[PDB]
Amino acid sequence: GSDTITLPCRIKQIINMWQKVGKAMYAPPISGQIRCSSNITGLLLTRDGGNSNNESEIFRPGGGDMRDNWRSELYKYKVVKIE
Amino acid sequence: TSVITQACPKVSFEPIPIHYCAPAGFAILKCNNKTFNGTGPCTNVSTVQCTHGIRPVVSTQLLLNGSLAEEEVVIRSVNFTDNAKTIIVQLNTSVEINCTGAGHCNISRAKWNNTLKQIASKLREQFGNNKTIIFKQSSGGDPEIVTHSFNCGGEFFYCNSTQLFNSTWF
Amino acid sequence: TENFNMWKNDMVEQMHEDIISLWDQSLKPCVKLTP
């Protein structure tokens, strides 16, 4: 009928930075109605190895290099030197 | 080992579509090939003053609020052979993921299982004629890597996604 | 026409630095980085 994929989620305050190799801590929430509605537009995967060209291929979620996030939008572009 | 104590403030982070235009004596060349696939000699192409409305969303394993493929699901990687390299996937249709600070994110079961078989219709083998495609979840590593981490309403969410990547197809 | 593009950039390195510098001005924490 209306089967939805419920994913357990957690709000952390101490995080490993994505900018550079660091750690950061933010204040706890103040709002009691944090609400987001995003549109999955993609996926960033990775494949299991040691089974090259064989019958199965395992693919797991990935991410981490935020560059790979800009790359998905900028792929079709390029800067050429103009006179 | 630099520690910095700033007046940690409760602000609200909002994404402003960023347009990137031509930098100095350079020119931006947009490839118009509806299904341009990464590296290669783009046939249909043209100069532009600025790219397009790019929404800088920081998050893991799931690209959100961005550009979709206008034709079919297109994947891209530097080397589809080296298992160590990230494979980006551009989706055909958008999927929704509604989340709240109350600890959960729900996404339509049907909508997402469909995109999975679509992505499955072309994995590593390279749109391979056929073989078994398996979706498992993260092997391990940082919380931001092992879970769909993102900044929702200013707060940092770490959504457990074992349920999105745990299935088998052919 | 008939040009070349790839898994390199345009604004990948640029944008990355704009966004890193955008986050800094916005979401301020209490940082800790290792030199």
Tell me the DSSP string of B14-27: -PPPBP-B--SSEE
Q: If we measure between CA atoms, which residue out of B157, B170, B133 comes closest to residue B61?
A: B157
- Which chains have 3+ CB pairs within 8 A of C? A, B
Q: Which residues contact C21 (CB under 8 A, 6 or more apart)?
A: none
Assess contact for B55 and A72: CB atoms under 8 A: no
In a domain, B104, yes or no: yes
Backbone angles phi, psi at B72, to 5 degrees: -135, 180
Q: Which residues of C touch A67 (CB under 8 A)?
A: 12-13, 16
CA B81 to each of CA A36, B86, B114: distance values in angstroms, whole numbers, following the listed order: 37, 11, 26
Q: Which residues contact B101 (CB under 8 A, 6 or more apart)?
A: A11, A29, A31, A32, A33, A34, A35, B152, B153, B155
Structural domain count, chain B: 2
In a domain, B82, yes or no: yes
Burial (CB count within 10 angstroms: exposed 0-12, middle 13-18, buried 19+), residue B64: buried
Our measurement of the distance from residue B78's CA atom to the centroid of its chain's CA atoms, rounded to an integer in Å, reads 16
Q: Could you tell me if B69 and B145 lie in one domain? A: yes
In a domain, B151, yes or no: yes
Query: 3-class DSSP state for residue A52?
Result: coil
Resolution of the determined structure in angstroms stands at 20.0
Distance from CA of A16 to the nearest CA of C (A): 10
Q: Determine the residue type at A65.
A: D
Q: If we measure between CA atoms, which residue out of B152, B146, B150 comes closest to residue B58?
A: B150
Exposure on the CB side of residue A6, measured as CA atoms within 13 A: 6
Q: Which residues contact B82 (CB under 8 A, 6 or more apart)?
A: none
Handedness of CA B83, B88, B94, B100 (dihedral sign): positive
In a domain, B65, yes or no: yes
DSSP state letter for B84: T
Handedness of CA C26, A26, C32, A61 (dihedral sign): negative
* Residue numbers of the domain that contains B134: 58-169
Nearest CB partner across the interface for B3, out of C2, C14, C32: C32
DSSP state letter for B123: I
Q: If we measure between CA atoms, which residue out of B151, B154, B112, B140 comes closest to residue A69?
A: B151
In a domain, B3, yes or no: no
Q: Could you tell me if B19 and B83 lie in one domain? A: no
A73 membership: H or E segment, kind and range = helix A67-74
Query: 3-class DSSP state for residue C15?
Result: helix
N-to-C CA span, chain B: 50
Q: Could you tell me if B118 and B154 lie in one domain? A: yes
Phi/psi zone of residue B116: left (φ > 0), alpha (ψ -120 to 50 degrees), beta? alpha
Token pair 């879970």 is found at B147
What span, in angstroms and rounded, lies between the C-alpha atoms of A39 and A42?
A: 9
Q: Could you tell me if B119 and B164 lie in one domain? A: yes
Q: Determine the residue type at A36.
A: C
What span, in angstroms and rounded, lies between the C-alpha atoms of B83 and C8?
A: 19
Assess contact for A43 and B6: CB atoms under 8 A: no
Q: Which residues contact B86 (CB under 8 A, 6 or more apart)?
A: A44, A45, A46, A62, A63, A65, A68, B77
Q: If we measure between CA atoms, which residue out of B19, C9, B14, B21 comes closest to residue A72?
A: C9
Q: Determine the residue type at A11.
A: I
Assess contact for B136 and A32: CB atoms under 8 A: no
Query: 3-class DSSP state for residue B37?
Result: coil
Q: Could you tell me if B47 and B87 lie in one domain? A: no
Q: Does B63 touch chain A (CB under 8 A)?
A: yes
Task: Give the CA dihedral B65, B152, A36, C22, nearest 10 degrees.
Answer: -50
Q: Determine the residue type at C27.
A: L
- In Å, the largest CA–CA distance within chain B is 57
Burial B73-105 (b: 16+ CB within 10 A, else e): bbbbbbebeebeebbbbbbeebbebebbbeebb
Q: Could you tell me if B52 and B68 lie in one domain? A: no
What span, in angstroms and rounded, lies between the C-alpha atoms of B105 and A37?
A: 9
Q: Could you tell me if B100 and B17 lie in one domain? A: no
Q: Could you tell me if B102 and B30 lie in one domain? A: no
Assess contact for A54 and B124: CB atoms under 8 A: no
In a domain, B5, yes or no: no
Q: Could you tell me if B104 and B28 lie in one domain? A: no
Give the residues across from B27 on adjacent strands. A80
Assess contact for A19 and C23: CB atoms under 8 A: yes
Method: cryo-EM
In a domain, B6, yes or no: no
Is there a contact between B40 and C26 if contact means CB atoms under 8 Å apart? no
Q: Which residues contact B29 (CB under 8 A, 6 or more apart)?
A: A77, A78, A79, A80, B45, B46, B47, B48, C3, C5
- In Å, the largest CA–CA distance within chain A is 62
Q: Could you tell me if B97 and B67 lie in one domain? A: yes
Give the residues across from B100 on adjacent strands. A35, B104
Distance from CA of C21 to the nearest CA of B (A): 12
What span, in angstroms and rounded, lies between the C-alpha atoms of A81 and B25?
A: 6
Q: Which residues of B touch A38 (CB under 8 A)?
A: 57, 64-65, 96-97, 99, 150
In a domain, B4, yes or no: no
What span, in angstroms and rounded, lies between the C-alpha atoms of B42 and B52?
A: 18
What span, in angstroms and rounded, lies between the C-alpha atoms of B70 and B74?
A: 10
Exposure on the CB side of residue A69, measured as CA atoms within 13 A: 27
What span, in angstroms and rounded, lies between the C-alpha atoms of C16 and C23?
A: 11
